């Protein structure tokens, strides 16, 4: 259920995923190169773009495990 705006944003922080490879709902983000400081930058970009503040459960490791869970988490905050 995500869109181009979200995926273009995420893919800036996934260095081991090529532009011609699909972004699967359940791909492990850490395995395609999301790491601690990539997450800080991602968070800063998601918060500025969507006018949201990630806090409480939205800052657990589980939030950034897959694009599926991260999209759901961002969605619950934008509405």
């Amino acid at each position: 259920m995500w869109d181009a705006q979200f995926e273009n944003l995420l893919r800036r922080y996934l260095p081991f995923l090529s532009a011609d490879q699909p972004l699967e709902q359940d791909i492990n983000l850490r395995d395609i190169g999301l790491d601690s400081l990539g997450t800080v930058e991602l968070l800063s970009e998601l918060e500025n773009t969507y006018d949201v503040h990630f806090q409480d459960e939205a800052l657990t490791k589980e939030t950034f495990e897959t694009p599926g869970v991260l999209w759901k988490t961002l969605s619950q905050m934008v509405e």
């Binding site: 790491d35 601690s36 400081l37 997450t39 800080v40 968070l43 806090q55 459960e57 800052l59 657990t60």
Partner: protein
Amino acid sequence: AGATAMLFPGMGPAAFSDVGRFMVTNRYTRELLAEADDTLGYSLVDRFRQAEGDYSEYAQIAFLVNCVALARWAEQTMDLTPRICAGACFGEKSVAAYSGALTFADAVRMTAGLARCMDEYFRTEHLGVVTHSFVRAPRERLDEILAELDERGEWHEISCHIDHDFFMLTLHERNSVWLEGRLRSVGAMPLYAMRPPMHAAAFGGLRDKAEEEVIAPLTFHDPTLPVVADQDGKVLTTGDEVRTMLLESFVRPLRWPDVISSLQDQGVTRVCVAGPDSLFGRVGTTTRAFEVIAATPRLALQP
């Protein structure tokens, strides 16, 4: 108009599959491995392959080889002439070798000896004490959490100042799950809980045991270029001061902002971070101040 510093990073979690192929093919690593294997009397790459954990003695020695080699690789392939150098945490060890304060052989011996020393100390001392890293934590938010710990009589020390909102806090792991939820409750994000812990006034006995059993036997030379202390950015110029830096590591916090302000004051505009690293080359403290070259195994493996 610029000037270049060579920086040596802290050790992140080893991952042999990240570097085993690099180490045996790159000529800079192969040359140091020959020396490390002769000093140690075994195959470091073989011992490191079989090591469990992320911070084994073997992964700490291999991390020394990888950082010191990638500093030389960067100098020879990028025409770098650094005026100054600095090492954060483990990188004090790598900068001692690069600067000439220790022969590479004595740096290998020291790295192995300190590995064994810390293992033994933390087998029995400060049981359950851990070093937490976290980000998006402005000092004002951290200070409120420390006051809550104080109110409950819970011992802690700040172990690293990384950036204005990035700290390491050392305390008993019984506080770990509260700290993590308490950080998140104000928009701060916990990263990692390090065992064994590092950089605490309470670790005087580890300093003393390191000094007696590992460091005092060694001959320290004056570095061939100035070294910035990671404790406070002091510009070091003698072997005695490098030796003091390695001992103070146990009992004084990393102050990364003070390394960056000192480098700036010594006229540095560009830094080379030598070795595998996903903190010192990328953190805002560094990138706001300097052009960064990140001399990683991944870069040196590129065609």
